[PDB]
Amino acid sequence: MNTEEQPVTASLVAEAQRLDFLPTYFGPRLMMRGEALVYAWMRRLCERYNGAYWHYYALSDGGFYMAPDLAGRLEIEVNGNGFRGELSADAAGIVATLFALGQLAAEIADTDAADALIDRYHFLRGFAAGHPEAAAIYRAID
Template identity: 30%
Template sequence: MNTQTPAAVHVDRLMTMRFLPMLFSHDYVRAEHNVFLYASRFLTSYDGCEWSFVALENGGGFMQPGGDKWHFSNPDNGAEVSLSAEAAGIVITSMVLNHRSWFYDRHDEPELCEHYCERFRQLTGFISAHPEYSAIYRALN
């Protein structure tokens, strides 16, 4: 079992145009919109902000909201956790990847479904060694 955390690198301005299609495939416009919708639903006091992109060494990545700390609240699972901006971005991106994979599984688009499943697996591999993994898993479960 690999216990080493994959490297996370903030994407520079030259790579931002390639990041969203890499993360979300040709569905990137809808998926990015989902990220913003999920943030407004689950991040207390979110009203828009600049997001940065983080690429993982294992080929995955996530979007990260600006700011330092965010309060995540999910009445569906009772989660109330304080997260760093990085952890908040991981949680929101994970939720979107999961949602989009189910959507495409049910709409007979196996290539997109598999793409989202792979990105979700890559991100959960990163979560397992993250310093805030307990809070991240609490938010996601």
């Protein structure tokens, strides 16, 4: 539609519907296999990262992403590319969920489903470009 940014934007799903929204967009079985995978990478990016509420977000691209609930400067040092920089719970939650997608795809070995969930990765990855901190987000996952 556009020539620069993407018309794709995330959204906040109800709390009483997010309980089924996750297993509905990811899978009734993955809901846990993925929620724990996104936070798994998060606690790795920061040495002083206890945890937070990874709110469920709906994407028009056909996927979805989760972002922890932390207001302030989150010192997140990504080992993936050694990018040391403080990001917001939102701009950081992008790198947390993204890394998880790439793990599940390679965790289930070479299967027809190892390329299906991959779609979500490419879908969200594009939304990160529309963010004001895109520079930090894309480099964080780079």
